[PDB]
């Protein structure tokens, strides 16, 4: 069994309604983790129970270098706690806010890792449903890790459908803004939006008014910069095709149509997963406790029976 007091609470990485995320150090081992700490009473009050429970079930039945790994899940009387591996490199949202726009080659590196992951997830009958720069993190070695699995759907294989209107407004596939059900293609739309942010330096469609933002995703055609490579333009036009059946990775082969596009001609898909590629960017951290790739906003602060049945957890690794 494991308890809140097996951990040293070192730095605050995030904070919101549902709780905090803290860099912590397991006292008995020395090894550093990110701990997601959530108030049970706020989770229950805002109908986010299933999501939390899905997140733990998903995180429990997944094994992949580009998906974040759960070491410990536990609860106290008023809290739920996930102890997952620490992403030293911060969010892509952080890096891309700084650089503004990545090179095609770098975009391509990250794009491959996301694709390999969505491949894995789709092979497990999971549809991720929340691809965004915020959910994409970088480990110590410079590799992507998907964080946050609350919005996933499970047991969707081949052409199974889903109904829940969910995810992130800016990142929503057109078919999810149409009434009725939708398939796993939505993940590829998602990839299309992040690759575009990485390459064209802005969101493909944006309006603070959500009514307009949806009129945009449904009706408007993406523009591309003039000197963006033709194979990049091709990839993006394919992933941001509005009709899912005509979208790249929207056919019966799924991730394979995306792997066999000529944007990725130089990528060896056997050796992406095996991690034989020197990443194009190494986070530049001095100590283990350095949080220069998270916001001063959070890091500068110092620190303090039915429903949750399938939650507690201890990893064998």
């Amino acid at each position: 069994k494991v308890t809140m007091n097996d951990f040293d609470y070192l730095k605050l990485l995030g904070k919101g309604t549902f709780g905090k995320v803290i860099l912590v150090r397991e006292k008995a081992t020395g090894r550093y983790y990110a701990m997601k700490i959530l108030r049970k009473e706020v989770i229950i009050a805002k109908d986010e129970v299933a999501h939390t429970v899905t997140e733990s079930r998903v995180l429990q039945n997944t094994r992949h270098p580009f998906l974040t790994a759960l070491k410990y899940a536990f609860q106290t009387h008023d809290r739920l706690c996930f102890v997952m591996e620490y992403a030293n490199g911060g969010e892509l949202f952080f890096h891309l806010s700084r650089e503004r726009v990545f090179t095609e080659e770098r975009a391509r590196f990250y794009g491959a890792e996301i694709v390999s992951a969505l491949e894995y997830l789709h092979s497990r009958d999971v549809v991720y449903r929340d691809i965004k720069l915020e959910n994409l993190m970088l480990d110590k070695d410079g590799h992507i890790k998907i964080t946050d699995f609350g919005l996933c759907k499970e047991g969707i294989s081949d052409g199974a459908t889903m109904k829940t209107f969910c995810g992130t407004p800016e990142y929503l596939a057109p078919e999810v803004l149409e009434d009725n059900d939708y398939g796993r293609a939505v993940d590829w739309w998602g990839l299309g939006v992040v690759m575009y942010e990485m390459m064209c330096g802005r969101l493909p469609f944006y309006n603070q008014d959500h009514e307009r933002l949806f009129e945009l995703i449904l009706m408007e055609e993406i523009r591309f910069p003039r000197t963006l490579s033709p194979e990049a333009k091709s990839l993006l036009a394919g992933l941001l095709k509005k009709d899912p059946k005509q979208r790249l990775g929207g056919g019966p082969s799924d991730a394979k149509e995306v792997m066999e596009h000529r944007f990725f001609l130089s990528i060896n898909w056997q050796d992406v997963v095996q991690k034989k590629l020197l990443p194009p960017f190494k986070p530049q951290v001095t100590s283990e406790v350095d949080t220069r790739y998270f916001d001063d906003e959070f890091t500068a602060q110092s620190i303090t029976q039915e429903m949750f049945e399938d939650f507690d957890y201890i990893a064998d690794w």
Partner: peptide, 10 residues
């Protein structure tokens, strides 16, 4: 830049 986004679910 661009502001931080927030996940929803109806």
């Amino acid at each position: 830049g661009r502001p931080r986004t927030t996940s929803f679910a109806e």
